[PDB]
Amino acid sequence: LSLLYHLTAVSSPAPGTPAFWVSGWLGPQQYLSYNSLRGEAEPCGAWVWESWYWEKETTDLRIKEKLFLEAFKALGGKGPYTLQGLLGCEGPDNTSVPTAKFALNGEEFMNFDLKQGTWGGDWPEALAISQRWQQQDKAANKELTFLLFSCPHRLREHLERGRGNLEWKEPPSMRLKARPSSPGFSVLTCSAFSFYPPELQLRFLRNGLAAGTGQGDFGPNSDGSFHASSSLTVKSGDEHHYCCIVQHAGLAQPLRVELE
Amino acid sequence: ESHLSLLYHLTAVSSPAPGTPAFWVSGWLGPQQYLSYNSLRGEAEPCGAWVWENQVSWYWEKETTDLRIKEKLFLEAFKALGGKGPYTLQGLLGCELGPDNTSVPTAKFALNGEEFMNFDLKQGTWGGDWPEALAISQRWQQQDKAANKELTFLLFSCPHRLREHLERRGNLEWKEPPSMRLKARPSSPGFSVLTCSAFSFYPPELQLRFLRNGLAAGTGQGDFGPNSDGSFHASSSLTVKSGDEHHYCCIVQHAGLAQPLRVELESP
Amino acid sequence: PSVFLFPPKPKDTLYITREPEVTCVVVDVSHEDPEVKFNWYVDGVEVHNAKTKPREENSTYRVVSVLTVLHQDWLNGKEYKCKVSNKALPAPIEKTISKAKGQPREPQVYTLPPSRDELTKNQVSLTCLVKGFYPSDIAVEWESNGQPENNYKTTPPVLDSDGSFFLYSKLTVDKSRWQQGNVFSCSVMHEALKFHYTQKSLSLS
Amino acid sequence: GGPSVFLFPPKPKDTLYITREPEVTCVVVDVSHEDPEVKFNWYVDGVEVHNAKTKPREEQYNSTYRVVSVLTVLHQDWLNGKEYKCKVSNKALPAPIEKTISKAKGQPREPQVYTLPPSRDELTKNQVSLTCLVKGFYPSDIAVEWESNGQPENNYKTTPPVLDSDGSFFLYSKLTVDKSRWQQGNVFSCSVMHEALKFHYTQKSLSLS
Amino acid sequence: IQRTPKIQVYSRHPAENGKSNFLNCYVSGFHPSDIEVDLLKNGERIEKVEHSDLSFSKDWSFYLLYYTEFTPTEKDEYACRVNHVTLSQPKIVKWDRD
Amino acid sequence: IQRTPKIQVYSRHPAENGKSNFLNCYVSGFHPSDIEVDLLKNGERIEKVEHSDLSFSKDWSFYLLYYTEFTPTEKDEYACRVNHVTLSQPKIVKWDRDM
Ligand SMILES: *[C@@H]1O[C@H](CO[C@@H]2O[C@@H](C)[C@@H](O)[C@@H](O)[C@@H]2O)[C@@H](O[C@@H]2O[C@H](CO)[C@@H](O[C@@H]3O[C@H](CO[C@H]4O[C@H](CO)[C@@H](O)[C@H](O)[C@@H]4O[C@@H]4O[C@H](CO)[C@@H](O[C@@H]5O[C@H](CO)[C@H](O)[C@H](O)[C@H]5O)[C@H](O)[C@H]4NC(C)=O)[C@@H](O)[C@H](O[C@H]4O[C@H](CO)[C@@H](O)[C@H](O)[C@@H]4O[C@@H]4O[C@H](CO)[C@@H](O)[C@H](O)[C@H]4NC(C)=O)[C@@H]3O)[C@H](O)[C@H]2NC(C)=O)[C@H](O)[C@H]1NC(C)=O
Ligand SMILES: *[C@@H]1O[C@H](CO[C@@H]2O[C@@H](C)[C@@H](O)[C@@H](O)[C@@H]2O)[C@@H](O[C@@H]2O[C@H](CO)[C@@H](O[C@@H]3O[C@H](CO[C@H]4O[C@H](CO)[C@@H](O)[C@H](O)[C@@H]4O)[C@@H](O)[C@H](O[C@H]4O[C@H](CO)[C@@H](O)[C@H](O)[C@@H]4O[C@@H]4O[C@H](CO)[C@@H](O[C@@H]5O[C@H](CO)[C@H](O)[C@H](O)[C@H]5O)[C@H](O)[C@H]4NC(C)=O)[C@@H]3O)[C@H](O)[C@H]2NC(C)=O)[C@H](O)[C@H]1NC(C)=O
C-alpha cells in the first residue's frame, strides 16, 4: 500500500477556488484534504472517526504551499501555470520506495533526486524552480527527511493504527442487461455497483466458454466505494447464450450473473 | 580625318604551336603597318613601303631593343599567373595625335580575348578590376625600371616618334582611288541583289551609297577588308524589286577622287 | 490539390510552458468542394485533439489543421501522420513528420569578440559559435543586462565535417556600447544540453 | 506530362576570374520520348546570339531526356547585369517556353573581411576552429577559401550568405585546425573573391598573438 | 497540454423506481483543472449537488465526482452537463440506467 | 572568350579572265589565334599561298589575310577553306566574282 500526496497549485485560480490544494491517499482511500483557503489539513471519510498528528501535517503542508506559490515567481510569466507534485512512498524487507515527481501544465518536468538531494529535470522551467527552491532555508533538507523518514514512519503508523480501515471489503451488486444497438447486433452490459477494494474482474462467457472482456468503464462513488461496467457486442438473438462472471475480494467464489 | 595613331599590337601565347612564335608584334602608323617583330627572329623589321624609306641611324636597333624587353615582360606575365592551361596576353600600346599638340595615350591589355588591365598614367602603374591584373601588375612592378620605361614610352617616346614620322609624310599621303563595279544577281523570286564593289583603294575611308532615280536609297549590307599591298577592298549589297534594277545607281566618295563618282550597272 | 506538413518550432519543443504544434496546410483545394476531412494519427493511433482553422479562400482554399503534441512524445521521435480527405482527391493524401533520427549531440557554445580591424567602425559585431549539434533544430538568442537585444541575425545550421551541425549568431552592437564594458550573453537552447539551456557571457577582457 | 525548363546562372568564381569561363546553363527536363528534338534560341538583351554549345540529348532513367544548352558569357557583360534569355522549342510544347537569368540588381557593396581566432574555452579541445567573417556585401554571389603556407586547407565549411539588417549580406567560414598546429604559430589566411572588392580578391591573415 | 474530459454517469446502487439512491457524474482525464459540471433532472439543473475533491491520476490529468441523492421514476430523465476549455460547447451525457 | 572567324573572299583588282590578279581570303574576328587556312582551285589546295601577320582588332579578336597570285578563267572555281577550334568542320567559302 502507498501513501501519496497529490499537490496542485494554479497561478490564476477561478474565483472562490484555492490557489493551492492537497489530497492524501492511503492506497485507494483518501485520508487527507488541504487547501490554501482553509489553511488546515483535515481527515477524509472513515479517517475522520479514527494524537497531535493533524497539527503537524497542517504545519508541513503550509510549508509546501509556500514552495509551490514561490515556483510561479521563479517562472515569471503573464500566462497561467499549473504546478503538480506527487510525493510519497511504498517494500520487500521493510524497505521504502520514495516517489517525488512534478508536472508543469500537465507535463512531467521535474523530480527530486534523492542521491544528490536536489530538484532536477531536463527543462529550463525545472532549472528555474529548482534554483529558487534550493535557496529557501532548509527546503532541500526537509524534502529529504519527508521522503526518506517521515513518509515511511507515517505509513507504518497508519498501517498499525488504521489496519481495519485499510482491510475494508464489500462485494459488488451485479446486473446484466441487453440493448438493441446495430441492426444485426446487440450490446450486453455487465454492471458492478458499490464495491470496496477497486480490484475487480468482469468476464463474458458464451455457453460457458470464454468470450473475453468488452469495453469497460470504472469510477468511484461518494463513499469511497467503486462502480464498474463492461459492455460486449453480440449477434442479435444470441444474447440468451451469454453469462457474466465477476471476481472480487468481497466474494468467496466467482459469481455467475444471468441476463433477463 | 586629322588624327593619326602610332599603335603596337603585342601578343604572347603560353603554348605556341610548333614553329610559331611565343610573342609577336605589329606596329601601325594609321592604317598602314610599318613594323613587324617576333620572338623567333628577335629583330624588329620594317613593313611594306617603310622598307624603302630611309630612316635615322639606329632607328631599327632601338625598336628591337625596346621590343625585346617587352617580350621578356609578356613572357614573365605567364609565370605570375602560374597555370598549366593556355593563356593569350594581348597589349595595345601607343598614342594618337589630334589637330593640336594633344597626344592621347593608349595602354590596354587583354587575357584570353577579354580586356582586363590598363596602364594608369596618373599613378604610373598597371591596374585593373581582376585578380590576374593584380598578379601581373605586381610582377611587372618588381622589374627594374619597367614602369618608368612604360610611362616614358607613352608620354614622351610615342609622341616624339609619331611627330618625327609625320614630318619626315610621303608614305602616309598616299591616295589611290577605287576601281568600281556594280552588278546584279537574281536572289529571291520577286527580288534581285545589287552589289557595288570598290577595289584596291587607299586610305580606307570610303562611302558607298545607292540611289534610285537619283534619290537616296540608303546603304545596304557591306563588307570591308585589306589587300596584300596595304590597300583596301569594300562591297555593299542592296535588295531591290526584280525588274527595277535599271533604276539604281551607286555613288562612291573617296579621297582619291576629286568628285563623287556615279557607277552604272552597264549590263550590256 | 497539395498537402504540406510542418514540424513544430524548436523553442516550443524545449519549453513545457510553450505549446508545440504540428501544422498541416492544404493548398490547391477546389472551390467545387470546400469540405476537407482531417484524420490525425500518432504511431498509427487516431487522435482527436487537433484544432482546425476555417477554409479561407486564389482558387486554393488554405484549410489548415494544427495538432498540439506532447513535449516528451516529440522528443522521443514519435511519428505524426495527417490524412486529408476530399471529393476532388481521388485517393486520400497522407503526410508524415517525425523528429530527425540520430543520437543527439550536446552543442558547444563559444563567444568571440569583434576583430581589431572592425573596432574602427561605428558598429562592432559580436560573434557566437554553436558547434557539434544534432538535430539541426536549435534556438539562439542574444541579451544584454537582462533586456534582450534585437539587432542579431543567426546563420542557418550548416552540416559539419564530423556529421554534426554548426551555427553562428552575429549581434551588431554600437562600438561605444562595447567599449563601455557591457556584458552581452548568448543564450542557446537544444535537446542535448543540460536543462535544454546554456548562456555564455562576453565583454572586454 | 508537362516539360519543364531550368535556367542556371554561372558560378561566382567563374565570373571574377577572366581565365575561368562563366557559363549560363539551360537544362530541359520532362522532354517527351515521342519528340526528342529540342530547338534552342539564345538572346542577350533581345539580340540573338549563336555561340552556345548544346550538349546531346542524354536519356534519363525516367522516360524523359536531359537536353542541356550552355552559353559562355563575357565577364564584363555578366557583371554589368545583362539579361540572358533562353527560348526552348519542341512539338510537345504548345507554346515555346522562355526563361531569363540576370545578375542580382542593386549597387554592389564591398565586403569587409575579419578573421577571428578560436575562443579560450575551445583551446581545451584537440581541434580549434578559426572563424572568418565576411559582412556587408551585395550580391550574395561570393567565393570563400582557406589556405596555410601556400598549401590550401580542406577542413573548412562555409555558411550560406545570410541577409543582414542593413539590406546587405553576411557569411562565416569555419576552418577546423588541430590545436597543436595553431599553437605552433602557423599563419592561416582566408581568401575571398567578390565583385565589389578591389581586384576581386582579398586575403586576411590570422595567427597567434 | 489541454486534455478533454471523459464523462461517466451511473447510479451508486442498481436503479429501482421509487427507491432512494445517488446519481453520480464522474468527470476524469481533463486539463486544465478549471471545469463546470451540472446534474440535470428532465433538463432542469439540480440544486442540491455535492462534489468530491479535485484530484489527479498518474498521468497528471484531473478527475472529479459530482453526486446527488435522488429517487428515480419511470418517466424521469437524468443527465450530466460539463463545460471545459477543450469543449466547443457544453457536453451533455444522459444517464443510461443499464 | 572564343570567337568564330568571319571569312571574306575577293580579288585585289576587278576580275578579268586571262589577266593576272591576286585572290584574297580575309579571315577576321576569331579567338584564339591558332587557325588553319587554305586556298583552293577547283577543290585542289593551292601551294604558293602567302599570308600577312596575325594581328588583332579593337575588340581583341584576331585577323589574317591569305593571298595568292592567279589568272582567273571562265571555268575555274576558287574557294577558301578555314579550320578553327570554334568550327565543327572546316568552313569553305567560294569566291563570288561580283563581290
Ligand atoms: C525524371 O528524373 C529527372 C532527374 O534525373 C534523374 O532522376 C532520378 C531517377 C535519379 O536517377 C536522379 O539521380 C537523376 O538526376 C527529373 O529532373 C528534375 O526535375 C526537377 C523539377 O521537377 C528539378 O528540380 C529543380 O532543381 C533546381 C535546382 O537544381 C540544381 O540542384 C539539383 C540538386 O539539388 C541538381 O540535381 C540540378 O542539376 C541543379 O544543380 C545545378 O546544376 C547546374 C547545371 O545543370 C550547375 O550549374 C552549372 O554547372 C556547370 C558545371 O559545374 C558550370 O559551372 C556552369 O557555369 C554552372 O551554371 C549547378 O552548379 C548545380 N548546382 C547544384 C547545387 O547542384 C531547383 O532550383 C528547382 O526549384 C524550383 O522548382 C520547384 C518545383 O517547381 C519549386 O518548388 C521551387 O520553388 C523552385 O522554383 C523556382 O523559383 C525561382 C525563384 O522564384 C524561379 O526563378 C523559377 O522559375 C522557379 N521554377 C519553377 C519551375 O517553378 C527544382 O527543384 C531537378 O533538378 C531535375 N533534375 C536534374 C538532374 O536536372 C525529371 O523531372 C523526372 N521526370 C519526371 C517526368 O518526373
Ligand atoms: C494560390 O496561392 C498560394 C500562395 O499564394 C499566396 O497568397 C497570395 C494571395 C499572395 O499573397 C501570394 O504572394 C502568396 O504566396 C498557393 O500556395 C502555395 O503552394 C506552394 C506549393 O509549392 C507552397 O510552397 C511550399 O512552401 C514550403 C515552405 O513553407 C513556407 O511557407 C509557408 C506558407 O504558408 C509557411 O507556413 C512555412 O512556415 C514556410 O515559411 C516549401 O518547403 C515547399 O517545398 C517543397 O515542395 C516543392 C515543390 O512544390 C519542392 O520544390 C521543395 O524542394 C520541397 O520539397 C519537399 O522536400 C522535402 C525534403 O526532401 C520533402 O519532405 C520529406 O518527406 C519525407 C516523406 O514524407 C519525410 O516525411 C521527411 O521527413 C520530409 O522532410 C517533401 O516531401 C518535398 N515535397 C515535395 C512535393 O516533393 C513548397 O515550396 C506555398 O507555401 C503555398 N503558399 C502558402 C501561403 O501556403 C496556391 O497553390 C495557389 N493556388 C493555385 C490554384 O495555384
Author numbering:
A (entry chain C): 5 to 54, 58 to 97, 99 to 268
B (entry chain A): 2 to 169, 171 to 270
C (entry chain F): 238 to 294, 297 to 444
D (entry chain E): 236 to 444
E (entry chain D): 1 to 98
F (entry chain B): 1 to 99
Sentences from the paper on this structure:
Overall, the crystal structure of Fc-MST-HN in complex with FcRn:β2M superimposes very well to that of FcRn:β2M in complex with Fc-MST (Cα RMSD of 0.62 Å using 380 atoms). In both complexes, the Fc is bound by FcRn in an 2:1 molar ratio and in an upside-down fashion (i.e., with the CH2 domains oriented towards the membrane-proximal region of FcRn). Our structural analysis established that while Fc-MST-HN retains all interaction epitopes on FcRn compared to Fc-MST, it introduces a novel interaction site centered around F434 in Fc-MST-HN, which exploits a hitherto unaddressed hydrophobic cavity in FcRn. The engagement of this site expands the hydrophobic Fc-MST-HN:FcRn interface with only a minimal conformational adaptation of FcRn at positions D130 and L135. However, in contrast to this clear role of F434, the electron density around K433 did not allow modeling of its side chain, indicating that K433 does not participate in the interaction with FcRn. Interestingly, although Fc-MST-HN predominantly adopts a predisposed binding interface, three conformations for the side chain of Y252 could be observed when no binding partner was present, which all collapse into a single rotamer upon binding of FcRn. Taken together, these findings demonstrate that Fc-MST-HN binds FcRn using a similar architecture as described for Fc-MST, and only deploys a larger hydrophobic interface to bind FcRn with a higher affinity. Indeed, our crystallographic model showing the architecture of the Fc-MST-HN in complex with FcRn, confirms that although Fc molecules can bind FcRn in a 2:1 stoichiometry, a similar architecture involving whole antibodies would result in a steric clash between the membrane and the Fab arms. The crystal structure of Fc-MST-HN in complex with FcRn provides a plausible explanation why the Fab disrupts the interaction only in the context of membrane-associated FcRn.
Binding to the neonatal Fc receptor (FcRn) extends serum half-life of IgG, and antagonizing this interaction is a promising therapeutic approach in IgG-mediated autoimmune diseases. One of them is an IgG1-Fc fragment bearing five amino acid (AA) substitutions (M252Y, S254T, T256E, H433K, N434F, or “MST-HN”). IgG1-MST-HN exhibits increased binding to FcRn relative to IgG1-WT at both physiological and acidic pH, but retains the natural pH-dependent binding profile. To gain insights into the binding mode of the Abdegs to FcRn, we determined the crystal structure of Fc-MST-HN, both alone and in complex with FcRn.
